[PDB]
């Protein structure tokens, strides 16, 4: 008797053929695509899921580049990509994509998940050094 988030998941895992997945005690579903690109699907809200791409711990040794990331965010804003965000509980960088649930489809979830992957992939290219 599940809300639409929990269907999309099941329907999505059916679409890519990886079996079955679920949401955890903390209302999210973390899977790592190719053991490098970490992604956690959250259903933050009745209206939307968030899509988190985790990019590791965040450097703090001459971290003048926090302003470089903030500068990178210009690119993702023009391109429609995820928001570059910093998170304090794991000191980890994050790509954030909101994903709304009306007119949501397994192919649309699949599409946006890999958007976070190509963002996490291309990130070092979008930066100056």
């Amino acid at each position: 008797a599940s809300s639409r988030s929990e269907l999309l998941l099941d329907r999505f895992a059916e679409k890519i053929g990886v079996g079955s997945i679920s949401f955890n005690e903390n209302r999210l579903c973390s899977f790592a695509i190719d053991e490098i690109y970490y992604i956690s699907l959250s259903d933050a809200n009745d209206e939307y899921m968030m899509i988190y791409g985790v990019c590791g711990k965040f450097p703090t040794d001459n971290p003048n580049f926090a302003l470089e990331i903030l500068n990178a965010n210009l690119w993702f804003a023009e391109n429609g990509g995820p928001y570059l965000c910093y998170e304090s509980g794991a000191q980890s960088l994050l790509l954030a994509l909101r994903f709304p649930l009306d007119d949501a489809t397994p192919e649309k979830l699949e599409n946006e998940i890999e958007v976070v992957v190509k963002s996490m992939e291309n990130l070092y290219l979008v930066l100056h050094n």
């Binding site: 679409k15 890519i16 053929g17 990886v18 079996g19 997945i21 955890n24 005690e25 903390n26 999210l28 973390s30 899977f31 790592a32 695509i33 190719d34 053991e35 970490y38 956690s40 988190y52 985790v54 990019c55 590791g56 711990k57 998170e87 304090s88 509980g89 794991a90 980890s92 397994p106 192919e107 699949e110 599409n111 998940i113 890999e114 992957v117």
Partner: peptide, 30 residues
């Protein structure tokens, strides 16, 4: 290690599920 055989935009080899990247289970609302 799950292999994807989908038409969708995941033309990529495998998915690993996590029970140097944190894979956090929560971020601070407040």
């Amino acid at each position: 290690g799950h292999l994807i055989s989908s038409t969708g935009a995941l033309g990529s080899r495998s998915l690993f599920s996590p029970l140097d990247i944190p894979g956090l289970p929560t971020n601070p609302s407040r």
